[PDB]
Design a protein around this ligand. Structure first.
Ligand SMILES: [Cu+2]
Ligand SMILES: [Cu+2]
Ligand SMILES: [Cu+2]
Ligand SMILES: [Cu+2]
Lengths: 128, 128
């Protein structure tokens, strides 16, 4: 299956998907984020962030406290495996990461860290 | 010859090379950019961008006008064949692209689109 996935974060606080699967044979994997709608990022900014399932909460709460100027992400957060930047409607961003960062059996989660968004905009990433 | 090259963009506005040659037999090619020095990206950020020689100017000027928040690159610029992100000193990024995107005889150029950098930080990429 393709070594990349196109994700949309819309004005209704939704990702167009809640489960991503990464093909074990890909040397790399790329996420392409877009923002259909009209709301600017200071009001409806969306990012795509990846961590183990266990680290999600801490990344989300430290991220909230970091501010908009930081893309609601804690600088040098060691729990973040890969991330795009905070995007506003009509904008785009992509992130590529080595498939060797993921492990079999481990449970990953992708999510948005804009305040209050993680509750709806979140999902699983599994290596298969 | 190797299917990858390590490039350095330093605080003096220089690439450690002005000519790259891509081995026709490689299925893919990877550029590894680094930034020796101390200047942050908002002051001395460097990226590695590839286009035909004819498209370089337009990519550079539209890039400038896009801003720092966009890595001084026009969103969805169709003229861009491959690119890394804008990097600051002590940082790193890599880009891999299919060697099949390049054509024999065509003339490519790699360059930095941080304002005013393309004048010094530029070079040729040829498929051989
Ligand atoms: Cu596949
Ligand atoms: Cu969001
Ligand atoms: Cu070779
Ligand atoms: Cu530069």
């Amino acid at each position: 299956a393709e070594c990349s996935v196109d994700i949309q974060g819309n004005d209704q606080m939704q990702f167009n998907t809640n489960a991503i699967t990464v093909d074990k044979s890909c040397k790399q994997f790329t996420v392409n984020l877009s923002h259909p709608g009209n709301l600017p990022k200071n009001v409806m900014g969306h990012n795509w962030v990846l961590s183990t399932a266990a680290d999600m909460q801490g990344v989300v709460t430290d991220g909230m406290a970091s501010g908009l100027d930081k893309d609601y992400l804690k600088p040098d957060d060691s729990r973040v495996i890969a991330h795009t930047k905070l995007i506003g409607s009509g904008e785009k961003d992509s992130v590529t990461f080595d498939v060797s960062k993921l492990k079999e059996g481990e449970q990953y989660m992708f999510f948005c860290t804009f305040p209050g968004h993680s509750a709806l905009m979140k999902g699983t990433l599994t290596l298969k």
